[PDB]
Amino acid sequence: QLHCSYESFDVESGVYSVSSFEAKPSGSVVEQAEGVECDFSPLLSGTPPQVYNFKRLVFTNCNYNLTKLLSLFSVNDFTCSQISPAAIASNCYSSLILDYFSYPLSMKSDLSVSSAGPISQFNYKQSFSNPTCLILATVPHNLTTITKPLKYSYINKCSRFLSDDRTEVPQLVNANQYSPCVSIVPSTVWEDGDYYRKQLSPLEGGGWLVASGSTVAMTEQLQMGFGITVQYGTDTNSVCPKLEFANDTKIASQLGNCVEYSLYGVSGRGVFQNCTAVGVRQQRFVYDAYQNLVGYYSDDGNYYCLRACVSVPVSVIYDKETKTHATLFGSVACEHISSTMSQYSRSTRSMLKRRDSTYGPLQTPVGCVLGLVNSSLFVEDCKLPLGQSLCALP
């Protein structure tokens, strides 16, 4: 590594830094759960809403397997903004939200989360603060408990007339909100190009609510769409994929020095310790001013502190005059040192072994070193000081 950094076959003698050890990671434990299967029965019957009438299901505290739902419909459009679709299925969340509606596929050209179509202008919008997904699908012939709208319908305009009869105020739909115009529009649009109006209250300054809409012919199989968003959180993450914890065989309280973990869907890696229990109790985790996890409350009544894991710094002593080298592992000390490392740094360290395969490691006041030899000599200047009073002679 040193030769490559200097683009040469002859690095000047000195002590040089090299990349650190990864500190030997180990298998995962989790503290997720619990909850019951998320009831998805509202989607199994009746007619789905017009694009301005959306149904919503908030899911908390429950378990899911979305592929079970996928088997129920043929999906003709799958897309997820800011998240892979595989991940959104496997992720655990503070909430899961599903919006669902009837939607002809003739209108699919006008719908994407970023679309400029009238469906997104006036009937539905999604926040981009949260990752999203979209699904378009149709009903199988054996799902007849679900039924068709007389016609598919949508609002293609939503604005309010100014009270002075010369100007008009447009009203694009707000993300995650019903358009205001829904208060006047009928549950279906009776005819394409129908429009409606309501006088605004005097508290609104007067003027008129205005809206208009359009329809699409009914189809042999019902066509529908879905909107999906998710919400991140910490100790609120009770929505999860169905989980199986068999043969961990143990979770928290089993140590460990570096282990992978997830707690309520919060990933990390580290070592835990049995410690006190600073407040606030039952707040799930605990964080520092830099938003790094400090520790965590558990259902065994034990507060665990978290130290992440500790990497090992490395440096190399290089003597170009004799073409020899030696190493220092720093403050880590020889007690964590072994003849080989799984921790790990570079694929081999055998060049050190050319002499050090035959000797034990040597502790020094700065730290453990390899191939140094304790001569107890006193020399005024090694031109290779190791810091403090340490000195490597050529």
Partner 1 sequence: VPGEMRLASIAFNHPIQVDQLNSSYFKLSIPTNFSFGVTQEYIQTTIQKVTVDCKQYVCNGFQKCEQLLREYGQFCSKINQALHGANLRQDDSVRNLFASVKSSQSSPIIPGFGGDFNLTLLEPVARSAIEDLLFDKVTIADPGYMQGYDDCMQQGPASARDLICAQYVAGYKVLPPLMDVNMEAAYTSSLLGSIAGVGWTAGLSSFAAIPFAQSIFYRLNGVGITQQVLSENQKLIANKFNQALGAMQTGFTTTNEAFHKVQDAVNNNAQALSKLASELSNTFGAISASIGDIIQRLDPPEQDAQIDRLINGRLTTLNAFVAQQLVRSESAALSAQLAKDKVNECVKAQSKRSGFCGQGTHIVSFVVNAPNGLYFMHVGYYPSNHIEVVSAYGLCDAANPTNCIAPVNGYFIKTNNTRIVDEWSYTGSSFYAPEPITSLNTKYVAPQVTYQNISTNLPPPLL
Ligand X SMILES: *[C@@H]1O[C@H](CO)[C@@H](O)[C@H](O)[C@H]1NC(C)=O
The footprint of ligand X on residues 175-234 (CB under 6 A) is 201-203
Site membership for ligand X, residue 39 (CB under 6 A): no
Size of the residue set binding partner 1 (CB under 8 A): 73
Site membership for ligand X, residue 388 (CB under 6 A): no
- Binding positions for partner 1, 222-261, rule CB under 8 A: 255
User: Residue 300 binds which entry of ligand X, partner 1, none, with Cβ cut-offs from 5 to 8 Å by kind?
Assistant: ligand X
Beta bridge partners of 24: none
* Residue 328 amino acid letter: L
Residue 363 Cβ, how far from partner 1 at the closest point, in Å? 10
Nearer to ligand X, 115 or 201 (CB): 201
- Reduced to 3 states (helix: H, G, I; strand: E, B; else coil), residue 80 is strand
- Binding positions for partner 1, 131-150, rule CB under 8 A: 131
- Binding positions for ligand X, 267-286, rule CB under 6 A: 274
Conformation bin of residue 357: beta by default, left when phi > 0, alpha when psi is -120 to 50: alpha
Nearer to ligand X, 23 or 391 (CB): 391
| Residue partners of 372: CB distance under 8 A and separation at least 6 | 326, 362, 364, 392
Nearer to partner 1, 69 or 362 (CB): 362
Residue 204 Cβ, how far from ligand X at the closest point, in Å? 8
User: Residue 280 binds which entry of partner 1, ligand X, none, with Cβ cut-offs from 5 to 8 Å by kind?
Assistant: none
Residue pair 156/213 in contact by the 8 Å Cβ criterion: yes
Site membership for partner 1, residue 127 (CB under 8 A): no
Site membership for ligand X, residue 53 (CB under 6 A): no
Report strand pairing: 62-64 vs 240-241. Answer: parallel
User: Residue 75 binds which entry of ligand X, partner 1, none, with Cβ cut-offs from 5 to 8 Å by kind?
Assistant: none
Binding window for ligand X (CB under 6 A); candidates: 114-122, 258-266, 299-307, 321-329: 299-307
Report strand pairing: 62-64 vs 36-37. Answer: parallel
Residue pair 271/308 in contact by the 8 Å Cβ criterion: yes
Q: Give the torsion sign (CA, 265, 98, 144, 119).
A: negative
User: What's the CA gap between 266 and 264, in Å, rounded?
Assistant: 6
| Residue partners of 301: CB distance under 8 A and separation at least 6 | none
User: Residue 301 binds which entry of ligand X, partner 1, none, with Cβ cut-offs from 5 to 8 Å by kind?
Assistant: ligand X
| Residue partners of 14: CB distance under 8 A and separation at least 6 | 318, 384
User: Residue 44 binds which entry of partner 1, ligand X, none, with Cβ cut-offs from 5 to 8 Å by kind?
Assistant: none
Residue pair 321/11 in contact by the 8 Å Cβ criterion: no
Beta bridge partners of 230: 96
- Binding positions for partner 1, 3-62, rule CB under 8 A: 4-6, 14, 16-17, 19-20, 22
Nearer to partner 1, 56 or 346 (CB): 346
Residues near ligand X, by CB under 6 A: 201-203, 274, 300-302, 362-363, 374, 376
